[PDB]
RNA sequence: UGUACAUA
């Protein structure tokens, strides 16, 4: 069966001045339609509390089905953003008992995220309690991980301890997971020092593997860009002596750049001198490499003058030849700009 | 000249 006459006429531009009240008895049908849903979304704000209640009445009967609908989920979200406190509370009761199922659903997870941004701390903690015992399942889920991230962003850290507890012994597995690595970073941004300490401790049991992992390299870079000095120095200690090799790696080259950027003055001198203070060809190998040439350029940018002079002494003899090299030519281009 | 992060 197909679209009602009213919906089809609306879609064919037959009612260019249509209003919400004209949709009586067809609100759910419009909400399940791409264009009908956009119409409701656009009209809900600027509408009168009386208009919203007729809309709210019809969706409420079908609230759960709309939360998981490709087009209806936006209408539910619109009531979390523009509804009265009572409407928001009534929607919370429709979510109650279904948080996990919605969090794992590709459209339901959008409703849960919007709710978390839109409701009181008390109402947030009702939602979070339903994820206790299902943390790892949600974190490793393509929809659920976004709900867990949003909880960490928006909810009092005290109520998040169950996530920290569930992550014990799982930090390497999650930091190397396409979805888990996102949640680890949210934890490092938003959780308390007592919560991040066991995460960081466990992280540091796996530094060398994480640095060269497809997803773990982002977690390591996060700590270098945002973490405490003590943790940055631990990380830098897994890179010293390894600059040449790691700079040639697609993933780890980015870690090397963050090490030289966020190091202390002395650590940065140590890492840069490793590849230019000895009489070896490390810097030349790096300049010609598809990834390490970016590391050389970063070292040029962050080097204090003493180290810049040392780099330039290694570079200058190769300048004329570098212009023909696929990646090396970018060193010459930088220095000739 | 270089890697993740989702709806019409």
Describe this structure in words.
The structure is a monomer. The protein has helices at residues 5-11, 27-31, 34-44, 49-61, 63-67, 72-82, 85-95, 99-103, 108-118, 121-129, 135-139, 144-154, 161-167, 171-175, 180-190, 193-203, 207-211, 216-226, 229-237, 243-247, 252-262, 265-276, 282-288, 292-302, 305-315, 319-322, 329-336. With 337 residues, the protein is mainly α. It is 69% helix and 0% strand. The longest helix has 13 residues, at 49-61. The chain contains 27 helices and no strands. It is elongated. The protein has one domain (1-337): Leucine-rich Repeat Variant (Alpha Horseshoe). The N and C termini lie far apart (66 Å). The structure holds one RNA strand of 8 nucleotides.
Concise structural overview:
The protein is mainly α and 337 residues long. The protein has 27 helices and no strands. The termini are far apart.
């Amino acid at each position: 069966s197909g679209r009602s006459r009213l919906l089809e006429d609306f879609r064919n531009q037959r009612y260019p001045n249509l209003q919400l009240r004209d949709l009586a008895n067809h609100i759910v049908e419009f909400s399940q339609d791409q264009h009908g849903s956009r119409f409701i979304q656009q009209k809900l704000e600027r509408a009168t509390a009386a208009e919203k209640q007729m809309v709210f009445s019809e969706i409420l009967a079908a609230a759960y089905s709309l939360m998981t609908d490709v087009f209806g989920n936006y209408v539910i979200q619109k009531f979390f953003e523009f509804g009265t406190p009572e409407q928001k509370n009534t929607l919370g009761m429709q979510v109650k008992g279904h948080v996990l199922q919605l969090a794992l659903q590709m459209y339901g997870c959008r409703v849960i995220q919007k709710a978390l941004e839109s409701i009181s701390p008390e109402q947030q903690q009702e939602i979070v309690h339903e994820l206790d015992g299902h943390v790892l399942k949600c974190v490793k889920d393509q929809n659920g991980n976004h709900v867990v991230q949003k909880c960490i962003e928006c909810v009092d850290p005290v109520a998040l301890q169950f996530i920290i507890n569930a992550f014990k012994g799982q930090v390497y597995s999650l930091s190397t997971h396409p979805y888990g690595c996102r949640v680890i970073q949210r934890i490092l941004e938003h959780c308390t020092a007592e919560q991040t300490t066991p995460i960081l401790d466990e992280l540091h049991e796996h530094t060398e593997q994480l640095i060269q992992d497809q997803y773990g390299n982002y977690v390591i870079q996060h700590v270098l860009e945002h973490g405490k000095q003590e943790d940055k120095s631990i990380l830098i200690n897994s890179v010293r002596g390894k600059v040449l090799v790691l700079s040639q790696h697609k993933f780890a080259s980015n870690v090397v750049e963050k090490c030289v950027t966020h190091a202390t003055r002395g650590e940065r001198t140590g890492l840069i001198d490793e590849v230019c203070t000895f009489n070896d060809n490390a810097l030349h190998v790096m300049m010609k490499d598809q990834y390490a040439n970016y590391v050389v350029q970063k070292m040029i940018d962050v080097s204090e003058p003493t180290q810049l002079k040392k780099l330039m002494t290694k570079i200058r003899p190769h300048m004329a030849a570098l212009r023909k090299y696929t990646y090396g030519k970018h060193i010459n281009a930088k220095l000739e700009k």
